Nucleic acid binder design. Structure first.
Ligand SMILES: C[C@@H]1CCO[C@H]2Cn3cc(C(=O)NCc4ccc(F)cc4F)c(=O)c(O)c3C(=O)N12
Ligand SMILES: C[C@@H]1CCO[C@H]2Cn3cc(C(=O)NCc4ccc(F)cc4F)c(=O)c(O)c3C(=O)N12
Ligand SMILES: [Mg+2]
Ligand SMILES: [Mg+2]
Ligand SMILES: [Zn+2]
Ligand SMILES: [Zn+2]
Lengths: 47, 66, 261, 242, 261, 47, 242, 66
DNA sequence: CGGGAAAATCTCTAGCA
DNA sequence: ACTGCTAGAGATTTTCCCG
DNA sequence: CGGGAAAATCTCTAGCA
DNA sequence: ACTGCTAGAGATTTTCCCG
């Protein structure tokens, strides 16, 4: 399992940690609180 | 029969990129085309490239200039 | 390092030092300091420094709206070639966008369209137009203009050309069509030293020609190749190598350890 | 290189065009073009036809690419010179338009259309058109119920005609045919450019008299002299500009 | 090419084609097409793709104002080291900026300050403060933030650190001072694996030490070197090479063709 | 002599041609109509 | 390497500290430090003094670095704990402050100052200060007419004291002296870090008993055993962690 | 006398940049310091660098670790 | 096999809400 | 489960041209 | 002299009105 | 006559450790 810290959309404040549901080249799908989200890999960090 | 078609399909040129390299690689030699992947021959190296990352042309300027 | 680990953790809970500071000031191995930093939720404030790569299949189009002199210009681009279409539309409505996309689909083989989440692109009319024309709509990540970088760049380019021809036209629609003409046929460059129109013609013709040629090759050349496995389909034998496809995996093997039936 | 004489023999007997010779015998296009241009026994993509159709009280401007039958049709608010000029400018920005044939109407003669054609470099001249314009009306009748406005039905009909109707020798569609034709014309233009660039040179070989250069290869130079094509080594030939 | 040149010029006066298009369509040499493009005033719409490099002398400071939660933070940075100072000021006035700069000059050897053209930095009070303290003011190109990139980046960094410590303080001035502390002494990196405070101490001490050491060397070692010229002053002889200074030009020559007196 | 085409300051429209008075690394000094100006080399082109 | 015995002889006779030995004989600092630490015959930068000065009805908080006499003085609106804590936090963010000595005043004892010192890791303890505080008043009297407000005059006096007044053995200023002292303390801290890192290792050479590692060079290993320092080849020694 | 001072001034490390290269070059060896220019020794190459482009340190971490 | 000149490639930036 | 790019301006590297 | 592991360096991006 | 930078996250290249 992984921890995801992300910046969602035009919001300077970083969220996290979120569960990584899917990883691709250039983006990821995260579940941060029964809220599935898709984030560019520029705006995310996976640990 | 088959050899002519194979030579013709090898006459096509392919420009491609790798998963993390933003620059376009030069005109590789097309060897095989499929629904999702393209098999190319670039500088003695046989590669499989995603179709989403390949621009396949013929280059009509070079074909007319042998 | 246990005692040093407690001191480093207590110091980081206050100053949030980077891994180098705690490695230097507490005699810690770099991995331990990096772990201490990585266990802090308040220190994860940066993403990985890379860009993605947009799809470049011959059927992909990117659509956007730009604004100039109070007018709205709907601009579409063919990602593979850089060929553009642009129309000055009275308003950013679903009707106008649906009409533009339906007219574009009837002039070129449009398979998928990549747009942002603007209200005009997400209307039910545009959805119905795409459904009728067999176009797949792809909105990427909301508020991520980079996913449409191609069309965005074209916006820039288009406006640039308009600034060069605005004095030759009395209306902005005329200048927009002149700019489309100039970009598509009066600017050469790119992969093949082409213009956008020449390049798109080459792309589409190459797509159809290669598809038919490979269809003929596969119809005529039928073989089964065993390497190291099951009956993998032969794709291309030559130059002391065999490219095959075993279980939806196109792989290259040396000519050795490969028998063709 | 070895197939030049075979190419001359093939053209003398079968009279094949330069593209077939270059494909079969693997010659540069300039050599095959000059082979077929040396036979005194031997010796369209850019034209469009414009028309207007009146349906349900509205005006549809239809442009047909006659080499392929490719239709581009738009409903216009009024049959005026400004609308015709805008339509022509759009057409010229979309496709390589060089000639348009019109029926000497009031709108097609106006000075705005003349100015647009002059800016876009289009030549204006005053049964493909009728056949396509009737087929378009048939398709519009078929698909009228699928749309509310007439313009949407017209664009749907254009889509169906260009990509959903197939026929001819090879069973291709109008879009496929027009891309093939335009690609062939691009090849023709590049070959003409190459010939024009090459024609300003002269070659001295073995020295013999001035000769016409055909191809400048990596390790060979193909030239013509006295209506005969010969290949000479690069070091054995000198090329000058005159 | 004369006729081709006239056709290319007439075509460019309408479409403004790039040099490749006119080279291809009129059989022109690339230099001729490039000249035709370069003679058009309407086609010069792009600058050279490079960045400059800011001065990095040990006495250079960059000052800027940033805003956070309705408060104004005046931030100064030492370019060589990355050492920062920051104060929450009630207003962007000449009085406050002059006081801040006068206090900064009395704590570190400030020689020149690099600021933008904000009204607070260009006031007569700041000018008088700099004149009294012997500081040279350098406003660069107006509305060019890149010339102050260092301080601009520090702004970013400073705010980042504040976002990590804002919960530990009840007032923004306390959080700003905590952030200054953390940046200056709790973050290690850069050229020497230093913190900002360690690096600035190293920079200043190295400056004074090297200046005195070179003064002693020049006082003791006095020689005149003739190469190939006049009596050039010897700078450094060694490793089969001689560095000398002839007529305000420090040049390196081989040991050969060099006589030392 | 040189011709300078420049973008002066937060104005998208390019000016020129201007006489080059001085050239440095990263910037230039131009005289565009009895108006001496200093422009970053990012915002200028010299011919 | 060859100067180790000469270093021991020099310390035995002249008793020079490790820095002078390392400078003269070109030794790694750990070797010279252990040489001077092996002589049983043988065997401040981070302290500041805070005070308050009342002048013209206003309060000036003055912090003096006593190793150099470096003054940092600010006029504060009120003699309260909050102002003192803010001043201390600024001082600690500017310079490496480890200890402050105060006169057990009401403001210096308040819980806000204690919290600020705890956060910044400063130890609080309850004639340099008086001398500097009188010199500051003299300079303020000199430069009062050059400014309107008292705070500007105080900062001008601080500037003059730190950089325009010179004296001592070498004729340096307070700023120069404080940078030298802080640089020396940085060197001391890095040497202590190196010694602490190295001390957790043991060396077996030629095998002999466990030995203390001193330096791990490119082609040599300097160790100590039985109160005697010896250099052995890298291949001839094995290093383990205990 | 002089040799000790020359060795000491050569003990200092210099980081520098070139007129059009944005990346910082490694710790060259200081050979000479002046008002406007600095003479350095980087990888067997003797260079003259503007003082405006040079950060001259000692690196006290490396000095204490021989 | 080799300099000078020219063509090709590499590097890098603004602007695209 | 999705994804920065593009055209131009210098600068530097490669290729060609005739000895 | 050589693999595995670790340290060092290179690449590259957001944010700084 | 002046001038983008900085710190962190991966990825790849270099060095060290003991045979
Ligand atoms: C209301 C719709 C839907 C949701 O988002 C908004 C806002 N937006 C913003 C930009 C923009 O930021 N351009 C600058 C830019 C920056 C970076 C980059 F890589 C590419 C770039 F073009 C657009 O282009 C755009 O079309 C929109 C838009 O349409 N909308
Ligand atoms: C009224 C004063 C005087 C004149 O100019 C204005 C406007 N301005 C704009 C930015 C700014 O654009 N930051 C973003 C950014 C963009 C690029 C880059 F390289 C660095 C960057 F920080 C500032 O920081 C800033 O201080 C000012 C300012 O102060 N003023
Ligand atoms: Mg956009
Ligand atoms: Mg700023
Ligand atoms: Zn943290
Ligand atoms: Zn132009």
């Amino acid at each position: 399992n992984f921890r995801v810290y992300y910046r969602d959309s035009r919001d300077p404040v970083w969220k996290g940690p979120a569960k990584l549901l899917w990883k691709g080249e250039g983006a990821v799908v995260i579940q941060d609180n029964s809220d599935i989200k898709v984030v560019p890999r520029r705006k995310a960090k996976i640990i | 029969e088959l050899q002519k078609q194979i030579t013709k399909i090898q006459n096509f040129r392919v420009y491609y990129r790798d998963s993390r390299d933003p620059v376009w690689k030069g005109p590789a030699k097309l060897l095989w085309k499929g629904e999702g992947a393209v098999v190319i021959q670039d500088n003695s190296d046989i590669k499989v490239v995603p179709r989403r990352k390949a621009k396949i042309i013929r280059d009509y300027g070079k074909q007319m200039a042998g | 390092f246990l005692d040093g680990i407690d001191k480093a953790q207590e110091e980081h809970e206050k100053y949030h030092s980077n891994w180098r500071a705690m490695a230097s000031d507490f005699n810690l191995p770099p991995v331990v300091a990096k772990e201490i930093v990585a266990s802090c939720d308040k220190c994860q404030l940066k993403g990985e420094a890379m860009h993605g790569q947009v799809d470049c299949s011959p059927g992909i189009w990117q659509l956007d709206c730009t604004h100039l002199e109070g007018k709205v210009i709907l601009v579409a681009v063919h990602v593979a070639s850089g060929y553009i279409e642009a129309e000055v539309i009275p308003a950013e409505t679903g009707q106008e966008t649906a009409y533009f996309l339906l007219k574009l689909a009837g002039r070129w083989p449009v398979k998928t369209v990549h747009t942002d989440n603007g209200s005009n692109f997400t209307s039910t009319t545009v959805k119905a137009a795409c459904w009728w024309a067999g176009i797949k709509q792809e909105f990427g990540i909301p508020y991520n203009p980079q996913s449409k970088g191609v069309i965005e760049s074209m916006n820039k380019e288009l406006k640039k050309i308009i600034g060069q021809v605005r004095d030759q036209a009395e209306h902005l629609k005329t200048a927009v069509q002149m700019a489309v003409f100039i970009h598509n046929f009066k600017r050469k460059g790119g992969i093949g030293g082409y213009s956008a129109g020449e390049r798109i013609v080459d792309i589409i013709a190459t797509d159809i020609q290669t598809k038919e040629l490979q269809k003929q090759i596969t119809k005529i050349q039928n073989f089964r190749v065993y390497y190291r496995k099951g009956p993998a389909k032969l794709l291309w034998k030559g130059e002391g190598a065999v490219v095959i496809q075993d279980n939806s995996d196109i792989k290259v093997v040396p000519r050795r350890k490969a028998k063709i039936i």
